[PDB]
Design a binder for this molecule. Sequence first.
Ligand SMILES: O=C(O)[C@H]1O[C@@H](O[C@H]2[C@H](O)[C@H](O)[C@@H](O)O[C@@H]2C(=O)O)[C@@H](O)[C@@H](O)[C@@H]1O
Ligand SMILES: O=C(O)[C@H]1O[C@@H](O[C@H]2[C@H](O)[C@H](O)[C@H](O)O[C@@H]2C(=O)O)[C@@H](O)[C@@H](O)[C@@H]1O
Length: 229
Amino acid sequence: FLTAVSSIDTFLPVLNEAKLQWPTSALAASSEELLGGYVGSQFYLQDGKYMQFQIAGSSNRCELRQMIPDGGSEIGWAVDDGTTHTATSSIVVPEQVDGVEEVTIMQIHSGEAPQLRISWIRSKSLDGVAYEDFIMSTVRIGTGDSSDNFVKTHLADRTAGAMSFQIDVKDSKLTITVNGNVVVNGQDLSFWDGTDSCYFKAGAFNNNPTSESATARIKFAALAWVDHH
Ligand SMILES: O=C(O)[C@H]1O[C@@H](O[C@H]2[C@H](O)[C@H](O)[C@@H](O)O[C@@H]2C(=O)O)[C@@H](O)[C@@H](O)[C@@H]1O
Ligand SMILES: O=C(O)[C@H]1O[C@@H](O[C@H]2[C@H](O)[C@H](O)[C@H](O)O[C@@H]2C(=O)O)[C@@H](O)[C@@H](O)[C@@H]1O
């Protein structure tokens, strides 16, 4: 078998507060299964050090979903509880194979919608400007489909090396730091005031591929979800 992610210490804290969804939103592995050696080509320890996710197919995923720690059920939190909810990662986004067009690698999501997606995207125009092979944030400020429901930002061009991300939510404000630099500084999340079902996700969620067989692949050198109070 492939080497399991849980065979080293690095990812145990997040696996202790996650379930894996693969190849859809259906459950693939409970937290205890993840901590106890769950493995496959979709989710394995790569190069002795990366938690790697792989998935093909439109809207398919191999994704961790935040759970109450220590064998608890699904978590839900609010954007304005006075604490800071923080997700910190170090991600190697390799060159994506032909047919893969957008891969969501971290989220804040609730019962209804994604508050935030951080995604790799092959090419896109944002605010009249073309970008290629880059990392984007998409924040929902509404539940509709017109462009005014979203705030989209160029976070960074994709690098060969690991790229760090920190997502901080405090007092209905979102901050995204990339390689130690604040990129998104206090984006308003007030539309979500009253929602108590938010949670973090991370992995690979394949969006709008041009081929159903093309496999998205994303490597995490680090991932942690914490609440600072
Ligand atoms: O046409 C789009 O690509 C549309 O998608 C929106 O993101 C959605 C994702 O693609 C996934 O379907 C899932 O995560 O739901 C997302 C959503 O409904 O917010 C946005 O990227 C939007 O800007 C875009 O028009
Ligand atoms: O598939 C979706 O549209 C969303 O489902 C969410 O996962 C749910 C889902 O109901 C599962 O069947 C399971 O029973 O509970 C999941 C949960 O963790 O809340 C999310 O995967 C979400 O990202 C999807 O957009």
